[PDB]
Design an enzyme around this catalytic site. Sequence first.
Site, PDB file in Angstrom:
ATOM      1  N   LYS A 198     -32.195   1.961 -21.952  1.00  0.00           N
ATOM      2  CA  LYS A 198     -33.844   3.637 -21.438  1.00  0.00           C
ATOM      3  C   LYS A 198     -33.054   4.671 -21.759  1.00  0.00           C
ATOM      4  O   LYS A 198     -33.816   5.647 -22.800  1.00  0.00           O
ATOM      5  CB  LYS A 198     -33.807   3.214 -19.457  1.00  0.00           C
ATOM      6  CG  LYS A 198     -34.618   1.784 -19.608  1.00  0.00           C
ATOM      7  CD  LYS A 198     -35.321   1.859 -17.664  1.00  0.00           C
ATOM      8  CE  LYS A 198     -36.667   1.420 -17.540  1.00  0.00           C
ATOM      9  NZ  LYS A 198     -36.264   1.735 -15.687  1.00  0.00           N
ATOM     10  N   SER A 217     -34.621   4.345 -12.384  1.00  0.00           N
ATOM     11  CA  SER A 217     -35.463   3.227 -13.262  1.00  0.00           C
ATOM     12  C   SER A 217     -36.770   2.759 -13.395  1.00  0.00           C
ATOM     13  O   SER A 217     -37.383   2.080 -13.345  1.00  0.00           O
ATOM     14  CB  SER A 217     -34.660   2.256 -13.545  1.00  0.00           C
ATOM     15  OG  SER A 217     -34.220   1.171 -14.267  1.00  0.00           O
ATOM     16  N   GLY A 261     -32.484  -4.943 -20.212  1.00  0.00           N
ATOM     17  CA  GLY A 261     -33.521  -4.001 -18.886  1.00  0.00           C
ATOM     18  C   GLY A 261     -32.883  -2.381 -19.183  1.00  0.00           C
ATOM     19  O   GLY A 261     -32.762  -1.926 -20.151  1.00  0.00           O
ATOM     20  N   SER A 262     -32.892  -1.696 -18.342  1.00  0.00           N
ATOM     21  CA  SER A 262     -32.810  -0.487 -17.966  1.00  0.00           C
ATOM     22  C   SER A 262     -31.987   0.130 -18.388  1.00  0.00           C
ATOM     23  O   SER A 262     -32.098   1.093 -18.696  1.00  0.00           O
ATOM     24  CB  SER A 262     -32.758  -0.100 -16.277  1.00  0.00           C
ATOM     25  OG  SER A 262     -33.803  -0.313 -15.526  1.00  0.00           O
ATOM     26  N   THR A 263     -31.114  -0.906 -18.922  1.00  0.00           N
ATOM     27  CA  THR A 263     -29.392  -0.151 -19.532  1.00  0.00           C
ATOM     28  C   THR A 263     -29.914  -0.132 -21.138  1.00  0.00           C
ATOM     29  O   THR A 263     -29.012   1.023 -21.727  1.00  0.00           O
ATOM     30  CB  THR A 263     -28.476  -1.563 -20.316  1.00  0.00           C
ATOM     31  OG1 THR A 263     -28.453  -2.379 -20.370  1.00  0.00           O
ATOM     32  CG2 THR A 263     -27.636  -1.612 -18.631  1.00  0.00           C
TER      33      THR A 263
END
Length: 490
Positions: free
Chosen positions: A239, A291, A235-237
């Site tokens: 980005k 996010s 997920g967002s980690t």
Amino acid sequence: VRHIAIPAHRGLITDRNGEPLAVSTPVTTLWANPKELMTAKERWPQLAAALGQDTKLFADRIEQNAEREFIYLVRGLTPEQGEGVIALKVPGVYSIEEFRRFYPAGEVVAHAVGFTDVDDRGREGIELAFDEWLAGVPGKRQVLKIKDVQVTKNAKPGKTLALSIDLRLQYLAHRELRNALLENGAKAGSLVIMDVKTGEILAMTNQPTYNPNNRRNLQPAAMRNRAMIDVFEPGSTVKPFSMSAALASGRWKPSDIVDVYPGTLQIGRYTIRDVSRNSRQLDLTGILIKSSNVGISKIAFDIGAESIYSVMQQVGLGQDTGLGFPGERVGNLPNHRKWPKAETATLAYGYGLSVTAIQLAHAYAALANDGKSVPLSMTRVDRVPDGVQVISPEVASTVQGMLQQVVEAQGGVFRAQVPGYHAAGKSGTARKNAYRSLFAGFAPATDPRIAMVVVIDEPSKAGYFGGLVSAPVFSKVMAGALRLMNVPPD
């Protein structure tokens, strides 16, 4: 003339400072020649009673094996307890001196060290991975069956192995993760600490854990080396890697603005939808703090998925770690010839792939190490390998600064703040309403030394996101790790 093997003394495993983690400890295995034992039956009940066995069950075993000139009775009694049996002086009861492993730090470093089987062979963790180095080569000798004719081969001992693990950081990580699991009533968790300069894994703890000195009632869930085996959508980690590609494209700078109103983006039939939908214009740092999947999707459509995929591949996502541990999963970084909009967007906001906590830490280490990847090591590194420059130092520096703002800016992950130091990182939430809370970061933000990943599996309290479940664990363990390593406060 029979040839019987002399067990080699298994090599000492230490932490990086020489603290003993696995030690080969003298024990006594009592065997017997039934045909000899058969001649001393009135001694059997006393032998039985000693050996913990029941008289008739013991008599039943010996009688049926009356043909065999050898069988075991018991393995790895103490030297002096198995002497209280050699003190019965029962005909046909001979003994071998043998080694068993002891694990002085027990459950604290269970998964990383692992354990040996009944034959003293590595079955999990480092014991398995470096089985050859640790086992040595057993010796043999010709014997009449009476007298030891000669040692025809010398039993050479296994070699000492110094892990990358710092037992002091391993105790801190084990304790802080254990406390976070009970405060969030979570099922399981992982925490990895890496030296960003050396590729060394300074700590790897999984909860639940087990005592490898007593595996009697060992549940398979406690045995699971989650850091290296559990795969999840990061997920967002990831980005920050999408952003690395954006800043390397020549088309994006941090002060550039993206309009994410109204928090949704229709791409044909599929609609991309942000977790928070209270924004119009956001700068690139803002896209990370919020996010915004819409924000990172528009950037990804502009630069193309190929650029993002290449950064993610180069920092090792969905790739072999090279650590050669038993269970380890490599996950999946999917590739395409033609990247449609949907797959472009999902890769960019981290559902287009699955990774392990170790791969995610390793990717964060490269970014922290001004864009230079260094091979992962579970053994002490004396000579640092040449890195690969996978992200330009200038991009890596810019993305570091953005991640510092993620932790420190107004609207940011304040719970990740490290008392004493500037830290940088990104929270994430990976849905399995069961999910993993993620936090990935490094410190000190301006001159990174340590990268860390925290995974909390199904936090079962009100608090949802990575930004309040995983982030405070990163705070405490990072503050502790930096001071144990005498890293000066910035």
